[PDB]
Amino acid sequence: EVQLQQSGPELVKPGASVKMSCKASGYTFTSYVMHWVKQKPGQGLEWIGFINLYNDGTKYNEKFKGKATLTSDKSSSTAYMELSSLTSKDSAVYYCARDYYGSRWFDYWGQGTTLTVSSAKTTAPSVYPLAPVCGDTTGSSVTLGCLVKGYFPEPVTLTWNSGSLSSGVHTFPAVLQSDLYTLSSSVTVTSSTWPSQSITCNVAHPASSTKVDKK
């Protein structure tokens, strides 16, 4: 059981400095190399760096030299980045990595974080239940959902009946452009399940709201 853990989501201001802590379990630390990979969605992944845990050989990429700093500590069993020269194009997922040979490949990976850059202000979301055209069941199956508008932070996590309804569901992404986020989800449910089984949309949101809306 050699797995890794990281911190949670992070929101940062432009021009600031942010940190990464990386913990693991199982075997020793100073015998191996910690390795480190970047991922931005919709685009191929990219290696960042590596640090050996005995001599601390500091070397970054041909582009990322002088940009991010890589350190570690053995007593806390932790690896550390500090990120500066911040800008909004790197709001993405960063991945900690365990070496298997001489900083040459990777064998297991941590969970990484969502490092996001803050813009505008953190607003509470506006949720709207999707109302049918005719109301009651007027066909073989009916369609319902959830329309959410006007929120800054990404953790707007959409649950039906507090974690249920994993079948016949359409989870949907959010749009980061202009700091205007729209969430639109739809569920197609059967004809004889309308008046008793009214499935509720649920936004889980730590900075703003734990909101529940019933149709």
Binding site: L130, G145, S186
Partner: protein
Amino acid sequence: DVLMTQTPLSLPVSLGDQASISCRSSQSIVHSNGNTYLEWYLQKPGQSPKLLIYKVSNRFSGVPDRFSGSGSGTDFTLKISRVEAEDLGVYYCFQGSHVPYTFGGGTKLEIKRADAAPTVSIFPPSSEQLTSGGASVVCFLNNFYPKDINVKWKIDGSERQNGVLNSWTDQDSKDSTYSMSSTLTLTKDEYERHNSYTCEATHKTSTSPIVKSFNR
């Protein structure tokens, strides 16, 4: 600089057929030891990716032996047969030769199945948003099997692709298809300049584009 060529960008695979994927290098791959060290990684959507193939054909301790690796030179292949359901995700190959140890992306798994009929529905906006001076028509068009879908929006016989946002989804775990959401967002004074609202889609099973117009 390091570039990699993903000539199998996508692939047709159903549950039980074969496939071969050739990650291709721009230059040679040889090392001073005479060997090459090429690695392929698997990501199921939801969890962190893990090591699958580490040198060419030998692998990680505890993986199934059903995948296989081969090749030497500038293009390197992996072969699979009798494809299961629990090994879906995205594959990655690592460049083995040059000094900047740059990753390589763009190799994903695609489940083959029969095509699916469109499901079209229209949502006029809720009154809470109508009290705020804005409105948003929603057209949900679901169960699209291929990715060549062309959407249009019409408002009283007039073509305007303005104020329109669109939302996709990835490969479903159980439905194994796509889904489509289209929102047209304007103000309430910009709403009631016209009456009928139309969403139109271009699919391949429906040999004519599907047109749906509602009134309120």
